[PDB]
Every structure is written in C-alpha cells, then in structure tokens.
Amino acid sequence: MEFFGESWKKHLSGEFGKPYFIKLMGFVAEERKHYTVYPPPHQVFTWTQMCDIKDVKVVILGQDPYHGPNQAHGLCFSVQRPVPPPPSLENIYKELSTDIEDFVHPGHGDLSGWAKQGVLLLNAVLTVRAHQANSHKERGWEQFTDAVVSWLNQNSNGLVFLLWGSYAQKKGSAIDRKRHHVLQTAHPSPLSVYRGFFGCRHFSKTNELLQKSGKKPIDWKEL
DNA sequence: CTGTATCTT
DNA sequence: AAAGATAACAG
Ligand SMILES: O=c1cc[nH]c(=O)[nH]1
C-alpha cells in the first residue's frame, strides 16, 4: 500500500522508467533539500488514491498545487481540515452555490468526497516551491499528467474534462473532443475568476453531460 | 492596502 | 524566458 493507488500505478508505471520522469523526481528531490515543496511527498499522488482509474468520470484540471503552508494535499483545490478553504476554493464554492441549487458551503475545504465519486482532481503540475505559483512548471510534470490524460482519453469514454486556467488548457489538444466533453474556463483564483469562472456552470453542465451519457451524476454536495 | 492569473512584450 | 501591466476583492 503506498503513494500510487494500484490501478493508477498499473496504467502509469511505464512512465517511471522514462528519462524525463527520473529527471523530474530528481528535480523535486533536489528542491525539497533547499526549499519547502508542496505537497508533502506522501501526498503528491493523492489523486490516485480516491477511486479506481476506470471509475474516473470527470476530470478537473488545475494549474499547480497551493503554495501556502498546509494547503496542497494532492487533490487540486482541496485542503484538509482544519485548513480553511483558500481563495480559489471559496470561489469554487461560490460558483457551486449559484450553479447547484442544493449546494451549500461544507464548512471545510476537503474535496475527497468528489474524488471518491470519480472526479479526478488533477493539476497540470504536481509540485510547487513554497510561495511561488507555477514554480515547478516545465520540469517534466506536464509530460506525466499528459500521460494520465492520454490514458483516460484512450481507454475511457464520455469523460467530462474541466480545464480551469490557461495551463490546464494546454491538455485540450490531447483530448478527443467528440469522444469526451471538454469544458474550459478561467482559473478560480481571485486573480482570474472574473474572466469566466463565475457563471461557467461547469458543475451543473458536467452532470447534464454525464446524464446524457447514461452515467450517474456527481453529487457535488457530497463532501 | 497586501495577497490570491492572463496577456503582452 | 521572464517580467510588466492589468485586475478584482477579501482580510
Ligand atoms: O490545487 C490547486 C490549487 C490552486 N490552484 C490550482 O491550480 N490548483
């Protein structure tokens, strides 16, 4: 039992031996010696421990992990108790509130509830240097998350991809737009939320798309 | 008033 | 590549 959930490791292990991955892990290792890197090592792959890869139905793709102390824990936009929801998450909650009638602020920021239902909470970049947004971009993470997106794209069907922000949107070309649904909008951070995230209705839209594909909708309130 | 993207150069 | 300009609002 460890970092990678079994089904994910089984389908993503081929990346482990590739030079970019070995180099990526080396960079992250080196960074952790000189700076605080988020999330902690045992939580970088939390997104593989919530459900079987074949049970993924929705993929929310963010930019990179929260860069503040105690925030990031491996699920994009999620913070474990007792850490209060960061600005981005408060905005996600505000959107859910107007988008989903029954949605009410859960009193915490832990999104494991969605992840357990098949919502992959992935970030384009999986580690970040403390206090430096997107500091670990272009070091190899993108190729790894490309592998995750590619596998899902090729082996699943009717997945709903939620690409939040410019960086997450780089994965768009990797998805078969007829085989899957790709919804794109601005990143929920206060610095960009006003550019489309508010009013995007991605949560209700995701459920509509799921229902049309004959899949059970995500209970966004189940947190 | 300080901290939490996106576009342009 | 990296940083300036722009931007919106909570604590
Ligand atoms: O996990 C997170 C948190 C904030 N912003 C992101 O892109 N991802």
Side-chain angles (χ1 to χ4, degrees), chain A residues 62-66 75-78 88 123 164 187:
Chain A
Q63 179 188 107
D64 72 316
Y66 283 123
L75 301 177
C76 69
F77 307 103
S78 189
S88 291
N123 272 320
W164 294 353
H187 191 277

Side-chain angles (χ1 to χ4, degrees), chain A residues 124-171:
Chain A
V125 166
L126 302 171
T127 57
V128 64
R129 184 191 289 174
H131 307 113
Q132 290 171 219
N134 231 6
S135 49
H136 290 190
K137 70 171 184 191
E138 292 178 87
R139 294 284 179 176
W141 276 126
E142 291 87 349
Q143 183 173 347
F144 183 68
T145 51
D146 267 353
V148 184
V149 174
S150 177
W151 191 89
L152 289 170
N153 174 69
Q154 182 182 341
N155 304 80
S156 310
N157 220 309
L159 293 180
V160 179
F161 284 87
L162 267 39
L163 310 184
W164 294 353
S166 175
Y167 287 95
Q169 287 161 16
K170 289 178 156 65
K171 273 73 174 65

